[PDB]
Design a protein around this ligand. Structure first.
Ligand code: CDL
Ligand code: 3PE
Ligand code: 3PE
Ligand code: 3PE
Ligand code: ADP
Lengths: 344, 459, 99, 120, 319, 39, 52, 47, 97
C-alpha cells in the first residue's frame, strides 16, 4: 500500500469510531459508522485471495443494510420529534430498530453469521481490528441510548449470542473462527447489562480487548490459524505456552484470573436487578465456552502434539519477537483480579 | 494468618531462583518449618474464634485443616521427587510451584471469612490440580479425566456463585461471622428449596456424593501421586468445609431437604464400599474407599447433630491422612511394578518387609480399629445417624462389614501370598518412600493420643 | 511409521550409589536431601511441634470449665440453688407474646 | 450512572475536588501490587523474547516496575475519588429524601419470637 | 531494522538496482560442473555466489555457523539417501524436505542481499529447480505418492510469494556422461547412484524445468563445453534482455513488503512446518522435545543472539 | 514408562474443518493453509 | 551473604514481613481497644494500652 | 560469535537513557505529587 | 405526509425485503440497497421541507454523499468478484463455510 493510502485508510478507520463517540447529533454518529464501513473494506482484501473478496463482499452487504436501517431510525425520529437524536418520548419501534441494526454491525445473536465467516477470510491482524476497534463504535451508540432501549430484546439477543457463540465454538477448529465465536459470546454479556448498568459494559469490553488483543498477536506470532498449528507452539516458541494457557482460561470465566470479574459483576448487577432467571442460564452455558477453550489448552500446552522435522529449521533461525504489548496486555489481563474493586 | 501464607508465597521465589540440584531440599526443608509456624494457630485458650483480620480467620474447623494443608506440601514434594526427576529442570520447578500454590490457595480457602473469597479461591484450586493431573498424567485418558474434574466442579460452581451473590442482596454481606450472628431463616418456599440445593450442590459434587462421584475414580486413576494425595487429603475436604460454613444460613430447609442426599449417601456408602471388593486397579479401590468414607461425612454434615459434625471433623482429617498413606504406598508398588493391577505383585512382604508394616497400619486405619481417630469418627457419625433413625445402623452396618473386607483384601492380595515369580526385579525400598509414609502415620499416631484438637466446631 | 524415541529404561539407581536414599542420583545431593528431610521432617516438627501442641494451655477452655463447674456446683449446692436450673434465659427477661 | 451529576467535568480525569481526599500512600498494597504486576510483565517479556529472564533489560525492568506504579498512584487517586463521590451522593440522598429511608426500630431478642425448629 | 519507516525515508530497493542486480540460478544434473560455472559467472559480473544449499545450509547461516549434529539438523543423510533407497525410515524424503527448506532459506537470504545491497545473486539450484529430484524419486520407488503431494503443497504455499529467477543458466551433460563423472569422483555413496535416477532428474529438467521457467524467466542452456567457458556464458548473460518476467512490476512500494518477508526467516519457512502429519516428516513429541532441549542448550543458542554469555556476549544487563 | 504424549492419531481428529463432523458437514475439507484457493 | 546464602533468607524473610504485616492489622482493628464489655478495665497505672 | 553479527551486540544506548531517564523523571514527579498532594489534602481539610 | 410518509416508509421496507432475500446477481441487491437511500433521502428532505427546518437541509445531502461512496465501495467489491469468479452470482460466495 502506498504508505499515503495506508495513512488515509487507517485515519478513517480511526476517525470512524472517534466521530461516533464524540458527536451527539445522531447523524454525525451515523457517518462515523459509515466511515468505519468504508475504511475497513480495503484492508480486508489486502492479500486479494479468492476467500478475501468473499469476506469483504459479505461484510460490506451486512454492514451496509444495517447502516441504512440505523439511518432510517434517525430519519423517523426526525419526524416524531424534530430533534436529530433519540429522546424519552421516542416511539419504541424506533429504538428497537436501532438495537437490531446495531446488533448486526456488532454481530450479536441471530445476526451472528457474518462475523464468523469474515473473521475466517481476513488476516489475523485485520481480524483484531474487525473484532475490537469496530465494536467500540456501535457500542458507543448503544451505551449512549441505554436509558431508552428495551430490556427484553437485549436480553434475548444477549442470551442467544451466548448460546450461539458457545455452541458454534465447540465444533470449530479454525482459530480465527473460534475467536469470532468467542467474540459473539462476550459481546453478548456486554449487551446484557447495557440496559441496567452501562458502565459495566465498558468493563466487559476493555477486559475482552485486553484479553483478545494478546490472544491474537499470539496466534500470529506463529501465524497459526489451526489448533494443530498452535499445538506445535511448544517447539516454535515455548514461553508463550504458559500465558496462552492462562489468557484462554481467562477469556472463559474461571475464578483466580482477571476474566472472572466481568462475568461476576455482570451477574451481581443482574441479580441486584432481579434477573436471576436470565443470569443463571447465561452463566451456565458460559461454562460451555471454557470447554472449547480447555480443549485448545489440551492441544497447545497440557499435551505435546507431534511436530515436523522441518520445524527444527525454524527454531534455528532467531524468532522475530512479539511486541511489548503482548506482555503488558497479557499480565494486566491474566492477573489483575486482586485489583478488581478499583476497576469497576 | 499471613505467616502460614506469606512465607508460603515466598516458596515460589525459592523454587525458581534456587539451583537445579538444590531446588528440592530448599523447598521441602522450608515448608516443613512452614508447617511448624502453622502449628501456632492451634493455641486457642478460649472458645472465641481467632479473627486474625478482616479477610482472614481461623476457627476450630479450619485450623485442623490449614495445618494438614501445610503438612502435605512437604510430603507431596517428597513423593514426587522420583517421577518428575526425569524432567528438564523447568518442568520440575513448575510442578513444585504448582504444589506450592495449591496449599497457598487451600490454606486461604480454609482460612477465609467471606464465603465468596471461598468461592474464588475454592474454584481456583482446580487450575493447579488440573495442570498436575493433565500435564504429568501417565495414562492416555487424563485429558478425559481432567475434563470430568473441571466440568463436574464448574457446573456445580456457577449455581453457588448465583446463590452467594443472592444472599448478599438478601442479607447484605457474605461475612461468615455476621451471617452467623444475623437472622437468616429461609422460608420453605419452592424457591428456597432451590437456593439450599444451589449452595450445597457445588460442595456435594467435590465431596463425591453417590450420584456425582464418577469424577473422583477417573481423576485419581491417571493423576500423578502428588495430585492424588492432594485430591484425597485436601481437595475433597474443601467440599465438607464448605458445607459446614454455608449451612449456618439455610437453617430451616435442611431439616426436610436433606433426606434425598442422606439416603443417596448411605445406600451410596454400601455400593461404593462393595465395588471396592472386586476392582482390579488398586488406585481404583482406594478412590472408591474414599467415596464411601466421604459418603459418611455428607451424612453427618446433614443430620447436623453436634456429634455428627465433630465425627465429621475427626474422620475428614483422619481419612485424609490415611487415604494419602494408601495412595502413597500404591504409587511405590506402581513405580516398581509399572502396572496398577492388584493381582500382580503378590507377596511383597516377602521382599519389602517394612513397607508391609506401613501397609498393615494404613489398612487398620482404613478399617475402624479402635485406638484410632478413624474409629472415633465413625463411631460418632454412627451414633447420630442411629439417633436420626434407629434403622440407619443396618446400612451403616453393611458398610462396616464390607469396609473390613476390602481393606484386608488390599493387604491379602498385595502384601501376602507367594511372591510373583519374576516381575522386573523389585529394587529395595528407598528411605524417601518409607519416610513419606512414616510422615503420614507418625502424625496419625500423635493425633489419636489427643483427639480434642481435630474435634470440630461443635465440641 | 513416524519418528519417535524408544521407551527408555528405568535405571537401577541402586547399582551405582549403592547407598541411594531415593532423593537424587548423585550421592552428595541425596545425603544432604535426607539429612535435611529427616531433620526438618521428624526432628523439629514431630518433636518440637508435639511439644508445643501438648503445652497449648486449657485448649478451647475445657480446663477452665472443670473448675468453674466445681465452684458453681460448690456454690449452688451449699446455697441450696438447683445445680442446673431448668430455664437459662430468665423467664422475667422474656416478654412472651401475650397471645 | 454517576455521569449527569451536577458539576460533572465533561472530559477531566480527576476534578480538583479530589484534592480534598487523602492521597494514596505510595506503599498502598495495591500500588505495590501494580509494581509486582509490572515486574512480572517485564520478566515475561524477557522470557517471550528469549533473553536471560532476570539478568536482562535491567533498565526495562525498571521502566516496567516504575511505569505501572506511576500509573497506579494517579489511577487509584481517581478511583478513590469516584468511590468518594458515590458516598457524597448516596449519603446526601438518604437525607434529602429522609422519609424513604426511615430508621426502623429493632426489638430486643426478648420481644421477638423466632420459631424453633428442633434438629432431633 | 528494515521497515516502512526506513522505506519511507529512502531505503528504496529500486534506487539501489543496476545492470547486474539479478538472480541467476544455474541448474544441472548430479554433476554438471555447475558450481564452477556459477562461481565464475558471479565473479565476472561481480555478484554474490551462494553455495548449493545442503542439509546444513541453515546452521552455517545461523549462530556459530558450525556444522550442527545430524539430529539437530533434521537427521538427513544424502549419503544414506543413496546406500539405502526406499528406506523404512524414509531418510530420503526427510533429506528432500530439509533440502527444500534449506534453499528456501538460501533463496530468501539471496533476495535480502539483492534488495538491500543491490548486488546480484547466483544461487545454483533453487526452490524452482528442486522438484526434479522428487519427480525422479517418485518415478522410482524412492518416494510414495502422498509424500509427493506433501512436497507439492509446501511448494505451492511458499514458492509463489518469492519473485522468479531472472534467468536460469542451465548445463546439460547427459546421464551417461554424469554417471561417468560421478564414478570418477571418489564419493563412495554418490557412486551408487542409479543411472535411472540421473535420467529421471535430467528429464524433469528438460521436460519440466526449462520450458516452465522459460516463459517467466530467461533461460540459457549450455552444454558441457560451453560451461567450462564461463566467459562465453557471461557474454550471453550480459546480452540478456530480461524483457519478460513478473519482475517487471516490482515497484519500490512493492519490493518493501517482499523485503520485509525475506528479512524474517521465521516466516519464509512458516509454511514449511505446516501441520500435515505424513509419517516421515513427523519428529514425534518425545524425540522432538529431547532434540529441542538439546538444540536449545547449545552455547549461544539458549538465548537470543546477543544475550547468551557463553560465547562471550556482554552488556546483557542493559540490553 | 513415560507419560503418554499424543500420537499422530490423537492429533488427526483436530484436523478437518469441523471438530464433530456431521452427516454432510464431514464431506467438507479443511481450508487451504495459504488462505488462497485453487479454483 | 550471597553465595547461595541469600536464597536461604527468602522465606525466613517472608515470615518477618508477614509478622509485620500481621501486627499492622492489629493496629487497624483497634477500635473497641478496651471498650469491650467483658474486658473493660481502668488502665492500670503506667499502662496506656490494654492490648497492643 | 555469530555469522550474522547480532543486532543486539552492543546496547542501544539511546534506549537505555530514555528508559532509565524516563523512569527517574516518573518517580521525581510521582514522589513530588504525593507530598505536594498530602499537603493540599491536609490544609484543604482542617489538617 | 401523513400517508405520503407511509408510502415512502413502505418503499423502504419493500426495498428492505429486497436486500435481505438474495437471488442470483449481486448487483440487484446493491441496486436495491440504493433504492433505500433514495427513499431515506426523499423522506428526510420531505419532513425538513414541511418543518421549514432549513438548518437541517445539510443532512439530506450528507446522506447522499456518504451513500454514494458507500455504493462506490460496494461496486468495487462487485467488480472484484466477477474478476475472480466471472460472475456476480452470490452462490459463488460460499467458500467461507
Ligand atoms: C491460581 C494460580 C495458579 C498458578 C498456577 C497455574 C497457573 C499458571 C500455569 C502455568 C503453566 C500452564 C501450563 C503451560 C505449560 C506448562 C508446561 C510447559 O511446557 O512450559 C514450558 C515453559 C518453557 O519455558 P522455558 O523454555 O523454560 O523458558 C524460560 C528459559 O528457560 C529461562 O528460564 P530461567 O530458568 O532463566 O528463569 C528463571 C526465572 C523464572 O521466572 C519465571 O518463570 C516467573 C514466572 C511467573 C509466572 C506468574 C504466573 C502467575 C499465575 C497466576 O527465575 C525468576 O524469575 C524467579 C522469580 C519467579 C517468581 C515467580 C512466582 C512469583 C509469585 C510471587 C512470589 C511472592 C512475591 C515476591 C516475589 C519476589 C521475587 C524475587 O516452561 C516455563 O518456563 C513456564 C514459565 C512460567 C512458570 C509459571 C509458574 C507460576 C507459579 C504460580
Ligand atoms: C493438628 C491438626 C491436624 C494436623 C495433621 C498433620 C500435623 C502434622 C504436623 C504436626 C504433627 C504434631 C502435631 C499434631 C499432633 C499433636 C499430637 C499431640 O500433641 O499429642 C499430645 C500428647 C500429650 O497428650 P495430651 O495432649 O496431654 O492429651 C490430653 C489429655 N487430657 O503428646 C504425647 O504424649 C505424644 C506421645 C507419642 C507416643 C504415643 C504413644 C501411644 C500411641 C497409641 C497408638 C494407639 C494405636 C493407634 C492406631 C492407629 C491406626 C493403626
Ligand atoms: C446443578 C447444580 C445445582 C443447580 C441448582 C440450580 C438452582 C437454581 C439456580 C441457583 C440460584 C438459586 O436457586 O437462587 C434462588 C432463586 C430464587 O431466589 P429469590 O430471589 O428468593 O426468588 C424467590 C421468589 N421471589 O431461584 C432461582 O435462581 C431459580 C432459577 C431458575 C433457572 C435456573 C437454571 C435452570 C436451567 C435449566
Ligand atoms: C419471506 C418470508 C420468510 C422466508 C420464507 C421462506 C424461507 C425459505 C426460503 C427458501 C429460499 C427462497 C425461496 C422460497 C422463498 C421465496 O418466496 O423466494 C424468495 C426469492 C427466491 O429467489 P430465487 O433465487 O428465484 O429462489 C427460488 C427458489 N425456488 O428471493 C426474492 O424474492 C428476491 C426478491 C425479494 C423481495 C421480493 C419482493 C418482496 C415484496 C413483494 C410485494 C409484497 C409482498 C408481501 C408479502
Ligand atoms: N533434492 C535433492 N534430492 C536428492 N539429492 C540431492 C538434492 N539436491 C541435491 N542433491 C545431491 O547433492 C549432490 C551435490 O550436488 P551437485 O552440486 O550437483 O554435485 P557437485 O557438488 O559434485 O557438482 C548431488 O550429487 C545431488 O544428488
Amino acid at each position: 500500500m502506498n504508505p499515503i493510502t495506508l495513512a488515509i485508510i487507517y485515519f478513517t478507520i480511526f476517525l470512524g469510531p472517534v466521530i461516533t463517540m464524540s458527536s451527539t447529533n445522531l447523524m454525525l454518529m451515523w457517518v462515523g459508522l459509515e466511515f468505519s464501513l468504508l475504511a475497513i473494506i480495503p484492508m480486508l482484501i489486502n492479500k486479494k485471495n479468492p476467500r478475501s473478496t468473499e469476506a469483504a463482499t459479505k461484510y460490506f452487504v451486512t454492514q451496509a443494510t444495517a447502516s441504512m436501517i440505523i439511518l432510517l431510525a434517525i430519519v423517523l425520529n426526525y419526524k416524531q420529534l424534530g430533534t436529530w437524536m433519540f429522546q424519552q418520548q421516542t416511539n419504541g419501534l424506533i429504538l428497537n430498530m436501532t438495537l437490531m441494526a446495531l446488533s448486526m454491525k456488532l454481530g450479536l445473536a441471530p445476526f451472528h453469521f457474518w462475523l464468523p465467516e469474515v473473521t475466517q477470510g481476513i488476516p489475523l491482524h485485520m481480524g483484531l481490528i474487525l473484532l475490537t476497534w469496530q465494536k467500540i463504535a456501535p457500542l458507543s451508540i448503544l451505551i449512549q441510548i441505554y436509558p431508552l432501549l428495551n430490556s427484553t430484546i437485549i436480553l434475548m439477543l444477549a442470551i442467544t449470542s451466548i448460546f450461539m457463540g458457545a455452541w458454534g465454538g465447540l465444533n470449530q477448529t479454525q482459530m480465527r473462527k473460534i475467536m469470532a465465536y468467542s467474540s459473539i459470546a462476550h459481546m453478548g454479556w456486554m449487551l446484557a447489562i447495557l440496559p441496567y448498568n452501562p458502565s459495566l459494559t465498558l468493563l466487559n469490553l476493555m477486559i475482552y480487548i485486553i484479553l483478545t488483543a494478546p490472544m491474537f498477536m499470539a496466534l500470529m506470532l506463529n501465524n497459526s490459524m489451526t489448533i494443530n498449528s498452535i499445538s506445535l507452539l511448544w517447539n516454535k516458541t515455548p514461553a508463550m505456552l504458559t500465558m496462552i494457557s492462562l489468557m484462554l482460561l481467562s477469556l472463559g470465566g474461571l475464578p483466580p484470573l482477571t476474566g472472572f470479574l466481568p462475568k461476576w459483576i455482570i451477574i451481581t448487577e443482574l441479580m441486584k436487578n432481579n434477573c436471576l432467571i436470565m443470569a443463571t442460564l447465561m452463566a451456565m452455558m458460559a461454562l460451555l465456552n471454557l470447554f472449547f477453550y480447555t480443549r485448545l489448552i489440551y492441544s497447545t500446552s497440557l499435551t505435546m502434539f507431534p511436530t515436523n522435522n522441518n520445524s527444527k529449521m525454524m527454531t534455528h533461525q532467531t524468532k522475530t519477537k512479539p511486541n511489548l504489548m503482548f506482555s503488558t496486555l497479557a499480565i494486566m489481563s491474566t492477573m489483575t483480579l486482586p485489583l478488581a474493586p478499583q476497576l469497576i | 494468618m499471613l505467616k502460614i501464607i506469606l512465607p508460603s508465597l515466598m516458596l515460589l521465589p525459592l523454587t525458581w531462583l534456587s539451583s537445579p540440584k538444590k531446588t528440592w531440599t530448599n523447598v521441602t526443608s522450608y515448608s516443613f518449618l512452614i508447617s511448624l509456624t502453622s502449628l501456632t494457630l492451634l493455641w486457642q485458650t478460649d472458645e472465641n474464634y481467632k479473627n486474625f483480620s478482616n479477610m482472614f480467620s481461623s476457627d476450630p474447623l479450619s485450623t485442623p485443616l490449614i495445618i494438614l494443608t501445610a503438612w502435605l506440601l512437604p510430603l507431596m514434594l517428597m513423593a514426587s521427587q522420583n517421577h518428575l526427576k526425569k524432567d528438564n529442570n523447568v518442568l520440575q520447578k513448575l510442578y513444585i510451584s504448582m504444589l506450592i500454590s495449591l496449599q497457598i490457595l487451600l490454606i486461604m480457602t480454609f482460612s477465609a471469612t467471606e464465603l465468596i473469597m471461598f468461592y474464588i479461591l475454592f474454584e481456583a484450586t482446580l487450575i493447579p490440580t488440573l495442570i498436575i493431573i493433565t500435564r504429568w498424567g501417565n495414562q492416555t485418558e487424563r485429558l478425559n479425566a481432567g475434563i470430568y474434574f473441571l466440568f463436574y466442579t464448574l457446573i456445580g460452581s456457577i449455581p453457588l456463585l448465583i446463590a452467594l451473590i443472592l444472599i448478599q442482596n438478601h442479607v447484605g454481606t457474605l461475612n461468615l461471622m455476621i451471617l452467623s450472628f444475623t437472622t437468616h431463616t429461609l422460608d420453605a418456599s419452592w424457591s428456597n428449596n432451590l437456593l439450599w440445593l444451589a449452595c450445597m450442590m457445588a460442595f456435594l459434587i467435590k465431596m463425591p456424593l453417590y450420584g456425582v462421584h464418577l469424577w473422583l475414580p477417573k481423576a485419581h486413576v491417571e493423576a500423578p501421586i502428588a495430585g492424588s494425595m492432594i485430591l484425597a487429603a485436601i481437595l475433597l475436604k474443601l467440599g465438607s468445609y464448605g458445607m459446614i460454613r454455608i449451612s449456618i444460613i439455610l437453617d430451616p430447609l435442611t431439616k426436610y431437604m436433606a433426606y434425598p442426599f442422606i439416603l443417596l449417601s448411605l445406600w451410596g456408602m454400601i455400593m461404593t464400599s462393595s465395588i471396592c471388593l472386586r476392582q482390579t486397579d488398586l488406585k481404583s479401590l482406594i478412590a472408591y474407599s474414599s467415596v464411601s468414607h466421604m459418603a459418611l461425612v455428607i451424612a453427618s454434615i446433614m443430620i447436623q447433630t453436634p456429634w455428627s459434625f465433630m465425627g465429621a471433623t475427626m474422620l475428614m482429617i483422619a481419612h485424609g491422612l490415611t487415604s494419602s498413606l494408601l495412595f502413597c504406598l500404591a504409587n511405590s508398588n506402581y513405580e516398581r511394578i509399572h502396572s496398577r493391577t492388584m493381582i500382580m505383585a503378590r507377596g511383597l512382604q516377602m521382599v519389602f518387609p517394612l513397607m508391609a508394616t506401613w501397609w498393615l497400619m494404613a489398612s487398620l486405619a482404613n478399617l475402624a480399629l479402635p485406638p484410632s481417630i478413624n474409629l472415633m469418627g465413625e463411631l460418632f457419625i454412627t451414633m447420630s445417624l442411629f439417633s436420626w433413625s434407629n434403622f440407619t445402623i443396618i446400612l451403616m452396618g453393611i458398610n462396616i462389614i464390607i469396609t473390613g473386607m476390602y481393606s484386608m483384601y488390599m493387604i491379602i492380595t498385595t502384601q501376602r501370598g507367594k511372591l510373583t515369580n519374576h516381575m522386573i526385579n523389585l529394587q529395595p525400598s528407598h528411605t524417601r518412600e518409607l519416610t513419606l509414609m512414616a510422615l503420614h502415620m507418625i502424625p496419625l499416631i500423635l493425633l489419636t493420643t489427643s483427639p480434642k484438637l481435630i474435634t470440630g466446631l461443635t465440641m | 511409521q513416524w519418528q519417535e524415541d524408544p521407551e527408555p529404561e528405568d535405571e537401577n539407581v541402586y547399582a551405582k550409589n549403592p547407598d541411594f536414599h531415593g532423593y537424587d542420583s548423585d550421592p552428595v545431593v541425596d545425603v544432604w536431601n535426607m539429612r535435611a528431610v529427616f531433620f526438618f521432617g521428624f526432628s523439629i516438627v514431630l518433636v518440637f511441634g508435639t511439644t508445643f501442641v501438648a503445652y497449648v494451655p486449657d485448649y478451647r477452655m475445657q480446663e477452665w470449665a472443670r473448675r468453674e463447674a466445681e465452684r458453681l456446683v460448690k456454690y449452688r449446692e451449699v446455697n441450696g440453688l438447683p445445680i442446673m436450673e431448668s430455664n437459662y434465659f430468665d423467664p422475667s427477661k422474656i416478654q412472651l407474646p401475650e397471645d | 450512572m454517576m455521569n449527569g451529576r451536577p458539576g460533572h467535568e465533561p472530559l477531566k480525569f480527576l476534578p480538583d475536588e479530589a484534592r480534598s481526599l487523602p492521597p494514596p500512600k505510595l506503599n498502598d498494597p495495591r500500588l505495590v501490587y501494580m509494581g509486582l504486576l509490572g515486574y512480572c510483565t517485564g520478566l515475561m517479556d524477557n522470557m517471550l523474547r528469549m533473553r536471560p529472564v532476570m539478568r536482562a533489560g535491567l533498565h526495562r525492568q525498571l521502566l516496567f516496575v516504575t511505569s505501572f506504579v506511576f500509573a497506579g498512584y494517579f489511577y487509584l487517586k481517581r478511583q478513590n475519588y469516584l468511590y468518594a463521590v458515590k458516598d457524597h451522593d448516596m449519603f446526601g440522598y438518604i437525607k434529602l429524601h429522609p422519609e424513604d429511608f426511615p430508621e426502623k426500630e429493632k426489638k430486643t431478642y426478648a420481644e421477638i419470637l423466632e420459631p424453633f425448629h428442633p434438629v432431633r | 531494522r528494515y521497515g516502512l519507516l526506513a522505506a519511507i525515508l529512502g531505503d528504496k530497493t529500486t534506487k539501489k538496482l543496476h545492470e547486474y542486480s539479478r538472480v541467476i540460478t544455474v541448474d544441472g544434473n548430479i554433476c554438471s560442473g555447475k558450481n564452477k560455472l556459477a562461481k565464475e559467472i558471479a565473479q565476472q559480473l561481480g555478484m554474490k555466489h551462494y553455495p548449493e544449499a545442503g542439509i546444513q545450509y541453515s546452521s552455517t547461516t545461523t549462530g556459530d555457523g558450525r556444522p550442527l549434529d545430524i539430529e539437530f539438523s533434521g537427521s538427513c543423510s544424502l549419503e544414506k539417501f543413496y546406500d539405502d533407497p526406499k528406506s523404512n525410515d524414509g531418510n530420503s524424503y526427510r533429506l528432500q524436505s530439509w533440502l527444500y527448506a534449506s534453499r528456501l532459506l538460501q533463496y530468501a537470504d539471496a533476495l535480502e542481499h539483492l534488495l538491500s545491497t543491490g548486488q546480484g545473486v547466483v544461487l545454483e539450484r533453487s526452490i524452482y529447480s528442486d522438484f526434479v529430484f522428487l519427480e525422479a524419486m517418485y518415478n522410482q520407488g524412492y518416494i510414495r505418492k502422498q509424500c509427493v503431494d506433501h512436497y507439492n503443497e509446501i511448494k505451492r504455499l511458499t514458492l509463489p510469494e518469492y519473485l522468479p529467477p531472472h534467468a536460469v543458466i542451465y548445463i546439460d551433460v547427459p546421464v551417461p556422461e554424469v554417471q561417468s563423472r560421478i564414478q570418477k569422483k571418489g564419493d563412495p555413496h554418490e557412486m551408487k547412484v542409479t543411472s535411472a535416477y540421473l535420467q529421471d532428474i535430467e528429464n524433469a529438467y528438460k521436460k519440466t524445468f526449462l520450458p516452465k521457467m522459460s516463459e517467466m524467466c530467461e533461460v540459457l542452456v549450455y552444454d558441457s563445453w560451453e560451461a567450462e567457458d564461463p566467459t562465453k556464458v557471461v557474454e550471453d548473460i550480459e546480452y540478456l534482455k530480461y524483457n519478460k518476467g513478473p519482475w517487471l512490476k516490482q515497484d519500490d512500494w512493492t519490493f518493501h513488503y517482499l523485503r520485509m518477508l525475506v528479512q524474517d526467516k521465521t516466516e519464509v519457512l512458516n509454511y514449511t512446518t505446516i501441520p500435515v502429519y505424513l509419517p516421515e516428516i513427523t519428529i514425534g513429541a518425545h524425540q522432538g522435545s529431547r532434540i529441542y532441549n538439546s538444540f536449545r542448550e547449545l552455547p549461544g543458542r539458549k538465548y537470543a543472539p546477543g544475550y547468551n554469555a557463553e560465547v562471550g556476549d556482554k552488556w546483557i544487563w542493559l540490553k | 514408562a513415560r507419560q503418554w504424549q499424543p500420537d499422530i492419531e490423537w492429533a488427526e481428529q483436530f484436523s478437518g474443518a469441523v471438530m464433530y463432523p456431521s452427516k454432510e458437514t464431514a464431506h467438507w475439507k479443511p481450508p487451504p493453509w495459504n488462505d488462497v484457493d485453487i479454483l | 551473604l550471597l553465595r547461595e546464602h541469600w536464597v536461604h533468607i527468602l522465606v525466613p524473610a517472608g515470615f518477618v514481613f508477614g509478622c509485620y504485616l500481621d501486627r499492622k492489622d492489629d493496629e487497624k482493628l483497634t477500635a473497641f481497644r478496651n471498650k469491650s464489655m467483658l474486658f473493660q478495665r481502668e488502665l492500670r497505672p503506667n499502662e496506656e494500652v490494654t492490648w497492643k | 560469535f555469530y555469522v550474522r553479527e547480532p543486532v543486539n551486540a552492543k546496547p542501544n544506548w539511546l534506549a537505555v537513557g530514555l528508559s532509565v531517564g524516563a523512569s527517574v523523571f516518573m518517580w521525581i514527579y510521582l514522589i513530588q505529587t504525593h507530598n505536594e498532594d498530602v499537603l493540599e489534602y491536609k490544609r484543604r481539610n482542617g489538617l | 405526509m401523513p400517508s405520503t410518509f407511509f408510502n415512502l416508509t413502505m418503499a423502504f421496507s419493500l426495498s428492505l425485503l429486497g436486500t435481505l432475500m438474495f437471488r442470483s446477481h449481486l448487483m440487484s441487491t446493491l441496486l436495491c440497497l440504493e433504492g433505500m437511500v433514495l427513499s431515506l433521502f426523499i423522506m428526510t428532505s420531505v419532513t425538513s421541507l414541511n418543518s421549514n427546518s432549513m438548518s437541517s437541509m445539510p443532512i439530506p445531502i450528507t446522506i447522499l454523499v456518504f451513500a454514494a461512496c458507500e455504493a462506490a465501495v460496494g461496486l468495487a467489491l462487485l467488480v472484484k468478484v466477477s474478476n475472480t469468479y466471472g460472475t456476480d452470482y452470490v452462490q459463488n460466495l460460499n467458500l467461507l463455510q
